[PDB]
From a paper:
We demonstrated IdeC is a cysteine protease that cleaves feline, canine, and human IgG between the hinge and CH2 regions, defining a new virulence determinant for S. canis. The structure of IdeC presents the α/β fold characteristic of the papain superfamily of cysteine proteases, consisting of an α-helix followed by an antiparallel β-sheet comprised of four/five β-strands. The active site, the canonical catalytic triad for papain-like cysteine peptidases (Cys-His-Asn/Gln/Asp/Glu), is situated at the interface and involves residues from both domains.
In an attempt to better understand the structure and function of IdeC, the crystal structure of IdeC (residues 30–339), with a C94S mutation to abolish catalytic activity, was solved at 2.7 Å resolution. The crystals belong to the P32 2 1 space group with one molecule per asymmetric unit. The electron density map allowed perfect modeling of residues 48–339, whereas no electron density was visible for either the N-terminal residues 30–47 or the polyhistidine tag, indicating an inherent flexibility at the N-terminal end of the protein. The catalytic cysteine, Cys94, mutated to a serine in the structure, is located in the L-domain, whereas the catalytic histidine, His262, is found in the R-domain. Asp284 (also in the R-domain) completes the catalytic triad by forming hydrogen bond interactions with His262, orienting its imidazolium ring for the proteolytic reaction. The oxyanion hole is formed by Lys84 and the peptide amide of the catalytic Cys94. Interestingly, a sulfate ion was present at the active site in the structure, with one of its oxygen hydrogen-bonded to the Nz of Lys84 and the amide of Ser94, mimicking the interaction of the scissile carbonyl group of the substrate and the oxyanion hole, which was also observed in other related members of the same family. The remaining oxygens of the sulphate ion establish hydrogen bonds with His262 and the side- hain of Ser94. Residues 254–261 of the IdeC structure form a loop that is equivalent to the prosegment binding loop (PBL) found in other papain superfamily cysteine proteases. The PBL in IdeC, interestingly only eight residues long (in other members of the papain superfamily being around 17–18 residues long), partially obstructs substrate binding and is structured by hydrogen-bond interactions involving the main chains of His253, His262, Ala320, and Ala321 and the side chains of Thr254, Tyr255, His262, Asp284, and Asp286.
Numbering used by the authors: 48 to 339
The structure:
Amino acid sequence: ITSIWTKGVTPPTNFIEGTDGSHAPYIANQGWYDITKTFNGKDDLLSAAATAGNMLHWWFDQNKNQIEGYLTEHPEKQAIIFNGEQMFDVKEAISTKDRQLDSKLFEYFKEKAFPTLSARRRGVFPDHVIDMFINGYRLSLDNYDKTPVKEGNKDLRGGIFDQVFTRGDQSKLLTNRYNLRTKTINEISQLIKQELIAGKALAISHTYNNIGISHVINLWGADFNSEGNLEAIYVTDSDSNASIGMKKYYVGVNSAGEVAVSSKKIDSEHLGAAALGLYTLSAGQGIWHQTN
């Protein structure tokens, strides 16, 4: 009965029943993004990096003018260039943020940043990715905690906007994570609601079919009932093909008593996918104006 959506995101309305479930096809310039995998081998396990990408594309919206100003003053930072390669151009990503399959940012992530990750059966965490790209924090594949906030070497695969968003300053770290596995429906519900009303972009993780790596999706919207508990969430999915777009997931407490999500209602025949983690991204619009 009450629905809340991410700052800068116009709610889709074109919801139809699909093979997965209720989905509204993607349309560009609506605030939300749907980076999707080509399953070319290099990106088969990068759902977190696609999720991260989505939130970055949203970040590029919320800070457009701020960004283009920064880049004309910091042209050096415009490209990612080491080893004698030109690995990435940030201006290309912004030009192509609206594209789903061929988005020049996701192209960077799968082809240059984490190419060998899927063959190694390893993934990343969305926050780690964003913290690498923006602040230039070195990403570890074996880090199961938040990014260590300390002054450190720039990750060569990131730090585009690290002349503003520095390392070793809590004020400059834009991301946040919460373990959902230790919480019940009530606490998770309110937790999503606060972060969403606080104009943050949301990414949720859950158990997939792979035993090593969790799946991660973008949480754009959320429906809450009388009680203030999550009734349903609206998400994009890297693994879902481009024709799907915004999916409606039901949220409930399963037989096992874990909070879970699925394309269909949670029942006894439908255990759902248990929610593992929540990752948030602030737009950091105020950050550009707090340095002295």
